[PDB]
RNA sequence: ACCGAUAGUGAACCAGUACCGUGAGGGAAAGGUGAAAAGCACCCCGGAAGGGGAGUGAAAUAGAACCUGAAACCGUGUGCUUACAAGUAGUCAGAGCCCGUUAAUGGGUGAUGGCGUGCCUUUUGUAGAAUGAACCGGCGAGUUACGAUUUGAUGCAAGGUU
RNA sequence: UAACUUGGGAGUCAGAACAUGGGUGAUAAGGUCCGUGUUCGAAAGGGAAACAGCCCAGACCACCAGCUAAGGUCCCAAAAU
RNA sequence: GACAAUGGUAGGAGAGCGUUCUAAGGGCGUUGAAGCAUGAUCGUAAGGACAUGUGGAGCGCUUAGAAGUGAGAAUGCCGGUG
């Protein structure tokens, strides 16, 4: 028995075209261009999920450094001081405290300074 | 000689920005009230400068 | 859980500072100003917004160099015309256009992005000790 | 047994392999023949011995 | 209330027709008629007939007042192309497209 | 295939110089209206199995009927003339299911004629028994003589 | 008053009456969960743990045990006819903080 | 357990025709209103074409290559956005604005920041300025027969099998 | 923690750099030919601005958690003015 | 429960998805089949539903069987349109 191409070809390509909605020009229209872009989008997303973790860690440190400098301490010493104190608040939580509650951050700084 | 790459719809349409025709320089004819080209005889009533042409 | 604060124009507050360039090395002053302009000294620092403060530099004419930079440090500019290379020494630039010397030094320490260009526009440099931004009520800043 | 509940003996039947039907199968494109040479050609290869 | 007329398979290329349609879109019918009369393009007389037919169907079919009518919609859709060939040098033939337009005019009383 | 399709003897255009893909005939597979590569070709699907397995298969199908209580033994079927209604009535009295395989020792014309038009009912001889017919049927109605004959054969 | 609590290999800054999303916990919906490890206590009274504040706990009520939005994980190596497509939905527990300490 | 209009005859149709060649010869494309023709009386714009009503019909968005009607491609309108900016066009982060769903720790858009030189082939190595593809659609490549061998399955077994 | 034997199925027989022992060339070559090791090939991630072959290290998937390697910590650009 | 493995080209091995047809069973459909279109749905992947619009008469599901069974690339063929 003969099997004609049928509807499977259209159904599959349409899914790819829908995945490339919002892309520029032909990239949101034609199957070949969108497929390539959707492939690139996957590879990028995979890479960027890992990169996101590196970026947010970087931001938290930057904000902590600024907060520490206001208390006349370097980030490097503050974190070394916190470790000696035995304080295990992570950089994200430290950054949030520095922004939200200055008085609480000041207390943590004193603990770090005392440990040194 | 020949296009290295095809022109996208975007590029083509940007080029066509100034590809347009203006409205005719027309004013209402005083005698009949139909629009006529300025400095031309009114086609409807065949009058120019308040005189039949 | 995602809990990181994000600064936005609604919550951002930009201050005005005056820094005296008298008796300061160009680069060391420059690097410090660049951080202030980019909001690096703020706990609310956010990369995709401008959290930095406006900086006024005065007495740019009195900025200092080390070694033989005055004669041996040369700025090169091209006009995009063949053989269109033009050079003036750092010392001559200090004499003629001290504000440019400071401005170019700091801008070279700022990112080449739309945001970075915007942050550079917040810098105001003056060769003399007098500035015209009294209305901004700027605060003196001492370099660390 | 029933004509609506037929089952072959376990291990009795295996599905044939089909080459040149995409990358994921592991037999797509070159179809297990590797790259170039007499052996990769249609009707290609040397006589036994 | 809206009244419409369509001229199908007009043997003029849509691109050419669309230039004139751009002039009259969103204008009062009386002004549109004047523009069409005094504009020197091939599409203008055909478009005028579509507009006149649309205004006629407003007055007759829907008893709208012609003077208050506005050209709400004016557009040209592509019709089927007449495929032709032109003999070129060295025995080669280059294709010629004789394109057609479907011209639609909608007139509205604004109510 | 490419040889069987009409025409296509000559080379469509010269090997080189035209800027076109090289082509050897208009009836090549990738051409519209070209020959098919490796399509269906006439062949038999029939194969054989050893006789002992054929016998085992029949006994296995018949035994499944007995285990499922699909075996009904009747003394004889008496039909002077073919009447479908009478046969239908007999099946109802026998309380037989919709799908029934009726077995006779030898060909009986009246029984075959009587049950021919009734959907779900199949009539076979004892020698005619085949696994497909037995497996398909919900129940089997066998004459005493047929049942004895089957026992001797298998 | 805020508290710093440790769950799912991460630390979360929490306040009373706040919904949180954490790595899946072994609890049914509508159950009460106590976060044993409190690193820091904020508010007017500040307490610093080294590494944990002793006797400090946060009580939360489980609202939902769910799976996150599907992540399509796709990678490829150009010209190698090699690619992999996998779907992922990360399990999570949604809770609401009832009381701190 | 053959095809179903690019399939199946080259030819479902006025096809060995049209068309091409001096000739031998080569050789297409092209099926579908509706149940019924009930195939749009009449009115209106227009020279006509074409259209708007009215009417027929279950349906005319079934009105003549008249079932369905994808995509490329071409328009019209609209929510968000864009004229100091260096772009494999995404991806990750993210205000503002506009919406509201298979109700889901929603949808559209996107100021601005980080990261990022298509795909295939062939290669020691290709962003490659090596190859290939204008785009979209359809079509397009390990098959079958008979032997051989090996593995799995099954029947029987010093027998097994025609 | 492999190894060997027997049997079914392969692909490969254009290699590259780097380091090091040598021939050749000129103690030329991103040269060429043999020995040895590694990487690439067939390997993404971090460093060397960019940069198959160098240095660090081998990506099952998810996380806005932590510690380190090479390499770094004035600004670009995370961390010592 | 514990802990071990899970980069990969040629290539070997395994398990599957989906297409058309057949058998048997069990179903759906003018109170609307297939196809088509749209959606914020589900599964580890191939892929599977559901709703609505369009459409107007066929078509799923289960188990097994059989193949003209899957296209993005061949200066591929034909058609349409840039
Ligand atoms: Mg078929
Ligand atoms: Mg196909
Ligand atoms: Mg990390
Ligand atoms: Mg298989
Ligand atoms: Mg392989
Ligand atoms: Mg391929
Ligand atoms: Mg090849
Ligand atoms: Mg080779
Ligand atoms: Mg080979
Ligand atoms: Mg000629
Ligand atoms: Mg060409
Ligand atoms: Mg054929
Ligand atoms: Mg068929
Ligand atoms: Mg068709
Ligand atoms: Mg045909
Ligand atoms: Mg034909
Ligand atoms: Mg602007
Ligand atoms: Mg971006
Ligand atoms: Mg290779
Ligand atoms: Mg180029
Ligand atoms: Mg070549
Ligand atoms: Mg090309
Ligand atoms: Mg070597
Ligand atoms: Mg820094
Ligand atoms: Mg691994
Ligand atoms: Mg693997
Ligand atoms: Mg295999
Ligand atoms: Mg096929
Ligand atoms: Mg194609
Ligand atoms: Zn007049």
- Picking from E5, E29, E12, the residue whose alpha carbon sits closest to that of residue E99 is E12
Q: Which chain A positions have a beta carbon within 8 Å of B8's beta carbon? A: 25-26
- Picking from C131, C144, C111, the residue whose alpha carbon sits closest to that of residue C16 is C131
For residue A27, report the distance from its CA to the centre of ligand 16, in Å: 37
Strand partners, E98: E82
d(CA B31, CA B48): 9
Dmax (CA) of chain C: 59
DSSP state string for C59-110: -GGG-B--TTHHHH-EEEEE-SSTT-EEEEEHHHHHHH-HHHHHHHHHHTTS
Residue C110 Cα distances to C16, C38, C42, C105, C113, angstroms: 18, 8, 17, 9, 9
E2-110 has which CATH code?
3.90.470.10
- Picking from E49, E41, E38, E6, the residue whose alpha carbon sits closest to that of residue E20 is E41
Q: How many domains does chain B have?
A: 1
- Can you give the residue ranges of every domain in chain G? 1-101
Indicate the resolution in Å. Answer: 2.2
Q: Which chain D positions have a beta carbon within 8 Å of G82's beta carbon? A: 23
- Total Cβ atoms within 10 A of residue C58: 21
Instruction: Look up residue A112 and give its two tokens.
Output: 């770090």
Strand partners, F140: F71, F101
Angle, CA of F2, F5 and F9, to the nearest 5°: 75
Tokens 């109510």 correspond to E111
State the SS3 of A26-77. Answer: HHHCCHHHHHHHHHHHHHHHHHHHHHHHHHHHHHHHHHHHHHHHHCCCCHHH
**Phi first, then psi: what are they for A85, rounded to 5°?**
-70, -25
Q: Which residues 28-47 in chain C show a CB within 8 A of chain A? A: 40-47
Asked whether the beta carbons of G4 and G11 are under 8 A apart, the reply is yes
Instruction: Look up residue C96 and give its two tokens.
Output: 């003629």
Q: Within 13 Å of residue G78, how many CA atoms lie on the same side as its CB?
A: 4
Instruction: Find how far residue C107's CA is from the centre of its chain.
Output: 6
Please classify residue F123 by burial: count the beta carbons closer than 10 Å to its beta carbon, then call 0-12 exposed, 13-18 middle and 19+ buried: buried
Nearest-Å Rg of the Cα atoms of chain F is 28
Way the structure was solved:
cryo-EM
- Total Cβ atoms within 10 A of residue F41: 6
**Phi first, then psi: what are they for C88, rounded to 5°?**
-135, 145
3-state secondary structure of C4: coil
Starting from the edge strand earliest in sequence, which strands make up the sheet with E2-10, in order? Answer: E2-10, E101-108, E70-78
* Torsion over CA: D32, D37, D38, D42 (sign): positive
Q: How many domains does chain A have?
A: 1
Tokens 């099946």 correspond to F91
d(CA C17, CA C123): 10
Which residue of chain F has the CA closest to D2?
F135
- Picking from A33, A28, A46, the residue whose alpha carbon sits closest to that of residue G83 is A46
d(CA B45, CA D27): 85
- Picking from F149, F145, F153, the residue whose alpha carbon sits closest to that of residue F73 is F145
- Those residues whose C-beta lies under 8 Å from the C-beta of residue E7, and which sit 6 or more positions away, are E46, E49, E50, E53, E101, E102, E103
State the SS3 of chain F. Answer: CCCCCCCCCCCCCCCCCCCCCCCCCCCCCCCCCCCCCCCCCCCCCCCCCCHHHHHHHHHHHHHHHHHCCCEEEECCCCCCCCCHHHHHHHHHHCCCCCCEEEEECCCCHHHHHHHHCCCCEEEEECCCCCHHHHHHCCEEEEEHHHHHHHHHHC
H-helix or E-strand spanning residue C35: helix C26-37
Q: Which chain A positions have a beta carbon within 8 Å of B10's beta carbon? A: 25
Range(s) of the domain holding residue A21: 1-116
Residues 6-25 of chain D in contact with strand H via CB under 7 angstroms: 9-13, 16, 18-20
Interface test with chain G among D19, D20, D22, D24, by most G beta carbons within 10 Å: D24
d(CA E18, CA E20): 5
d(CA E74, CA E79): 16
- Can you give the residue ranges of every domain in chain F? 1-149
d(CA E21, CA E43): 9
Strand partners, G67: G91
d(CA A88, CA E61): 83
In this structure, what is the dihedral angle of CA atoms E13, E15, E16, E20, given to the nearest 10 degrees? 130
Q: Is A86 on the interface with B (CB under 8 A)?
A: no
Strand partners, F125: F104
d(CA C11, CA C119): 17
Question: At what angle are helices C26-37 and C98-107 packed, to 10 degrees?
Answer: 60
Burial readout C14-46 (b: 16 or more C-beta within 10 A, e: otherwise): eebbbbbbeebebbebbebbbbbbbbbbbbbbb
In this structure, what is the dihedral angle of CA atoms C104, C109, C115, C118, given to the nearest 10 degrees? -30
Residue F133 Cα distances to D4, F59, F110, F142, G92, angstroms: 14, 13, 20, 14, 58
3-state secondary structure of E69: coil
Instruction: Find how far residue B4's CA is from the centre of its chain.
Output: 36
The strand pair at F100-104 and E93-98 is best described as unpaired
d(CA C49, CA C33): 18
Q: Is D1 on the interface with F (CB under 8 A)?
A: yes
In this structure, what is the dihedral angle of CA atoms G13, G17, G21, G23, given to the nearest 10 degrees? 80
């Amino acid at each position: 028995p003969r099997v004609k191409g049928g509807t499977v070809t259209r159904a599959r390509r349409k899914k790819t075209i829908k995945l490339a909605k919002g892309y520029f020009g032909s990239k949101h229209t034609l199957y070949k261009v969108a497929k390539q872009q959707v492939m690139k989008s996957g590879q990028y997303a995979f890479r960027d999920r890992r990169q996101r973790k590196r970026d947010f860690r970087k931001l938290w440190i930057t904000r902590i450094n600024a907060a520490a400098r206001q208390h006349e301490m370097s980030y490097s010493r503050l974190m070394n001081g916190l470790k000696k104190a035995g304080i295990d608040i992570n950089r994200k939580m430290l950054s949030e405290i520095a922004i939200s509650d200055e008085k609480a951050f000041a207390q943590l700084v004193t603990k770090a300074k005392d440990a040194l | 000689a020949v296009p290295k790459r095809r022109t996208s719809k975007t590029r083509k349409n940007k080029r066509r920005t100034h590809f347009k025709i203006s409205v005719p320089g027309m004013t209402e004819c005083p005698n009949c009230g139909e629009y006529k080209l300025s400095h031309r005889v009114c086609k409807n009533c065949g009058s120019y400068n308040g005189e039949e042409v | 859980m995602r809990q990181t604060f994000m600064a936005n124009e609604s919550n951002i507050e930009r201050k005005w500072y005056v820094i005296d360039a008298e008796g300061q090395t160009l680069g060391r002053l420059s690097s410090e100003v660049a951080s202030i302009l980019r909001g690096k000294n703020k706990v609310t620092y956010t990369p995709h917004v401008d959290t930095g403060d406006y900086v006024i530099v005065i007495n740019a004419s009195k900025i200092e160099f080390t070694g033989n930079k005055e004669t041996d440090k040369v700025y090169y500019r091209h006009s995009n015309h063949p053989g269109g290379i033009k050079s003036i020494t750092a010392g001559e630039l200090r004499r003629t256009n001290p504000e440019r010397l400071i401005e170019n030094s700091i801008k070279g320490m700022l990112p080449s992005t739309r945001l970075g260009e915007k942050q550079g526009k917040k810098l105001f440099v003056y060769g003399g000790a007098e500035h015209p931004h009294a209305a901004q009520q700027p605060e003196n800043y001492e370099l660390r | 047994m029933k004509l609506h509940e037929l089952k072959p003996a376990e291990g009795s039947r295996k599905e044939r392999n089909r080459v040149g039907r995409g990358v994921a199968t592991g037999n797509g494109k070159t179809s297990g023949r590797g790259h170039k040479g007499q052996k990769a050609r249609s009707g290609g290869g040397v006589r036994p011995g | 209330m809206e009244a419409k007329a369509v001229a199908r398979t007009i043997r003029i290329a849509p691109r050419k027709v669309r230039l004139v349609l751009d002039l009259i879109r969103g204008k009062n019918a009386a002004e549109a008629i004047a523009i069409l009369k005094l504009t020197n393009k091939a599409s203008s007389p055909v478009i005028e007939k579509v507009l006149m037919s649309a205004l006629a169907n407003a007055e007759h079919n829907y008893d709208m007042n012609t003077d208050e009518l506005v050209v709400k919609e004016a557009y040209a859709n592509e019709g089927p192309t007449l495929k032709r060939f032109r003999p070129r040098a060295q025995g080669r033939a280059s294709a010629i497209n004789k394109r057609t337009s479907h011209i639609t005019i909608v007139v509205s009383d604004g109510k | 295939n490419r040889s069987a399709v009409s025409g296509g003897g000559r080379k469509p255009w010269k090997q080189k110089g035209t800027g076109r893909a090289r082509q050897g005939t208009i009836r090549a597979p990738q051409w519209r209206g070209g020959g098919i590569v490796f399509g269906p070709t006439p062949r038999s699907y029939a194969y054989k199995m050893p006789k002992k397995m054929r016998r085992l298969a029949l006994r296995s199908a018949l035994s499944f009927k007995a285990q499922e209580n699909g075996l009904t033994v009747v003394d004889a079927f008496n039909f002077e003339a073919p009447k479908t209604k009478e046969f239908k009535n007999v099946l109802s009295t026998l309380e037989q299911p919709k799908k029934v395989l009726v077995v006779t020792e030898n060909e009986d014309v009246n029984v075959e004629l009587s049950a021919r038009n009734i959907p779900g009912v199949q009539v076979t001889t004892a020698q005619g028994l085949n696994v497909l017919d037995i497996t398909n049927a919900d129940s089997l109605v066998i004459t005493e003589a047929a049942a004895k004959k089957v026992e001797e054969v298998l | 008053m805020f508290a710093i609590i440790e769950t799912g290999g991460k630390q979360i800054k929490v306040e009373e009456g706040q919904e949180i999303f954490v790595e899946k916990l072994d609890v049914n919906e509508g159950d009460t969960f106590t976060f044993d490890k409190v690193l820091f206590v904020g508010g007017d009274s500040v307490k610093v743990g080294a590494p944990t504040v002793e006797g400090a706990t946060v009580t939360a009520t489980v609202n939902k045990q769910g799976r996150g939005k599907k992540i399509t994980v796709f990678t490829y190596k150009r010209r190698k006819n090699s690619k992999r497509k996998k779907g992922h939905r990360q399990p999570y527990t949604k809770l609401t903080i009832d009381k701190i300490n």
